[PDB]
Amino acid sequence: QDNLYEEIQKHAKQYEIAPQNAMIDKIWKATPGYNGRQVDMEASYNNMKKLKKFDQKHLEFKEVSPSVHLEDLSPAPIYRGHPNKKMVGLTIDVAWGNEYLPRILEILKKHDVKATFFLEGRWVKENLRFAKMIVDANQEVGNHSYTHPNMKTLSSDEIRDQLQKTNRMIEAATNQKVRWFAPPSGSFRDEVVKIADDFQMGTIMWTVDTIDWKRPEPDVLLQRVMRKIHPGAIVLMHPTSSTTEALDTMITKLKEQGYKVGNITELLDEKRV
């Protein structure tokens, strides 16, 4: 009946996905947009013409940008990636735990996965070689304040000083520009978010807390994560024994469920997985 080209045409709408716009969710606050897609006729045809049969596995796509982007939103915290993006973001808050950093970095290398390392400024100052170790492993770093105060109760001057001192220390020690800020203990108010934005940083929270600082059994941590994970989840960890013992299996199980796993910059990208 139809030739292969017509069969691909007939299936094009079935695999089309509209782009999704960024918005500020009443509950989850600032959420990125996510690319849509349409069938690339030429690449799809070229992938199927040797076997002369339609195979959806061999479709290729052109992506379609949304109209409203994360950077268009008013300042607001980011808890999650887009809920249709089959990706999980890993964040690691670092103010201690040097002895676990090399193993964590090796596990990430083994899986070719990235995590955002949010660094406390005083920790960087006192542990320059470990800060360098993280970026030498090709991992991105973010701002975790300078002394881990409760930023919700700080004056605006103190918020500005905490953020600025930390960025100066991180950028001197790693030569990387800082894009992301993680509040200590997740404690913030609107003025924290606005001042972080004045330093050109988004404020990153999470949706899945490992609570690894309580030293759970590794399997208890793994099960906690798998019970709570979802598309666009951001997972909060620290350099702990629990995280280090669970991380290899955790990434394996996430990939088995169909998730891409990456850092915050990758998670919030509009590009499709």
Catalytic residue among 82, 144, 148, 238: 238
DSSP 11-24: HHGGG-B--B--EE
Q: How many CB atoms lie within 10 A of CB 55?
A: 12
93 counts as catalytic: yes
For 264, the token pair is: 């915050």
Closest of 216, 235, 238 to residue 226, by C-alpha = 235
- Check if the beta carbon of residue 86 is closer than 8 Å to that of residue 131: no
Closest of 50, 216, 102 to residue 117, by C-alpha = 102
Pairing of strands 202-203, 87-94: unpaired
Spatial distance between the Cα atoms of 116 and 1, rounded to a whole number of angstroms: 53
Q: Which structural domains are found in the chain, ordered by start?
A: 4-71 (no CATH), 87-267 (3.20.20.370)
Helix, strand, coil tally for the chain in percent (to 5): 45, 20, 35
Kindly state the helix (H) or strand (E) to which residue 260 belongs, with its residue range.
Answer: strand 260-262
Please state how this structure was obtained.
X-ray
Spatial distance between the Cα atoms of 31 and 88, rounded to a whole number of angstroms: 14
DSSP 165-228: HHHHHHHHHH-----EE--GGG---HHHHHHHHHTT-EEB--SEE--GGG---HHHHHHHHHHH
> What is the resolution of the experimental data for this entry, in Å?
1.6
Q: Where are the beta strands (DSSP E) in the chain?
A: 23-25, 29-31, 36-39, 61-64, 87-94, 116-119, 140-143, 180-181, 202-203, 208-209, 234-237, 260-262
Catalytic residue among 93, 144, 148, 212: 93
